[PDB]
Design a protein around this ligand. Structure first.
Ligand SMILES: *C[C@@](*)(O)[C@H](CCCNC(N)=[NH2+])NC(=O)CNC(=O)[C@@H](N)CCC(=O)O
Ligand SMILES: [Ca+2]
Lengths: 235, 51
């Protein structure tokens, strides 16, 4: 996250970090005690991955961390149907053992398709992660967060040569300086509705980070909430 | 549901006679005022409880 602030412990208790052949390589959010939602481009291939919930500072111990192994990865079935487009950039991870929910480990809410879009169109969401804090720079030790405005589709389309599909949205500032970035992929874009946060987007891609005239591109979660609910049922 | 979400804290559906029915997401119950959403489990989704 470029141009954000330090989170307080427990401020984003749905946020998790992913670790693998690279540490802190992506984020995710808690769907329920057994399931994380993240970006499909984070988990191409079946390399072994671990999830850490209740994480705050990734170089210190808070005694709130819960580490789990990933036993099943379900990228959306249309991800990579077309090469290099980031269309349908969303995936689910099943954990080996249930998370234990508490103040530091809490799911994000997920509304139906209609209300997820209504919440997105409120026009202001929070994004969070341990990704780069400068474009091509170092990663964060302390979880970062940033409020980003929704950007109108036409402006969105004009900002880039790359294709923005109806499964995506733009968010960020016209003057640049504040954005998500590499390492933040998979992290949740959330909309707060009278004290209760709902998942409205997933950090997916962009051109550099925080450049004036460019915006962060997010997976539009409203299009996928039916799929998330179908695949993450507990029994 | 037209204005202010029908006064529903979370979800609104139009019923009949221009009236509304509110509802809430998993982990919440419709409060008795039939608008607000109250926690129905120790750690409901989407809320900060460290503070
Ligand atoms: C995988 C995930 O961490 C990143 C998130 C980048 C978000 N960028 C902004 N400005 N909000 N996703 C990617 O790296 C996907 N590939 C791209 O974004 C490429 N266009 C740029 C790759 C690069 O600059 O390193
Ligand atoms: Ca830590």
């Amino acid at each position: 996250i470029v141009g954000g602030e330090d989170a307080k412990p427990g401020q984003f208790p749905w946020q998790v970090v992913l670790n693998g052949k690279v540490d802190a390589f992506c984020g995710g959010s808690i769907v329920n005690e057994k399931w994380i939602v993240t970006a499909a481009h984070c988990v191409e291939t079946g390399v072994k991955i671990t999830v850490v919930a209740g994480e705050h500072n990734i170089e210190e111990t808070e005694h709130t961390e819960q580490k789990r192994n990933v036993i099943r990865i379900i990228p959306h079935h249309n991800y990579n149907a077309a090469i290099n487009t980031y269309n349908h950039d969303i995936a689910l991870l099943e954990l080996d053992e249930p998370l234990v929910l508490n103040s530091y480990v809490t799911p994000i809410c997920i509304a139906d398709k209609e209300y997820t879009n209504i919440f997105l169109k409120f026009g202001s969401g929070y994004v969070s992660g341990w990704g780069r804090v400068f474009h091509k720079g170092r990663s964060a030790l302390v979880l970062q967060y940033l409020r980003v405005p929704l950007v109108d589709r036409a402006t969105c389309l004009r900002s880039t040569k790359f294709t923005i599909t109806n499964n995506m949205f733009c968010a960020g500032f016209h003057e640049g300086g504040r954005d998500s970035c590499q390492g933040d992929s998979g992290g949740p874009h959330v909309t707060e509705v009278e004290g209760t946060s709902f998942l409205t987007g997933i950090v997916s891609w962009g051109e550099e980070c925080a450049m004036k005239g460019k915006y962060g591109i997010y997976t539009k979660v409203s299009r996928y909430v039916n799929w998330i609910k179908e695949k993450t049922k507990l029994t | 549901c037209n204005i202010k979400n029908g006064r529903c804290e979370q979800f609104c559906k139009n019923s009949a006679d221009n009236k509304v029915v509110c509802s809430c997401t998993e982990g919440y119950r419709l409060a008795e005022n039939q608008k607000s959403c109250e926690p129905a489990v120790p750690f409901p989704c989407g809320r900060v409880s460290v503070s």
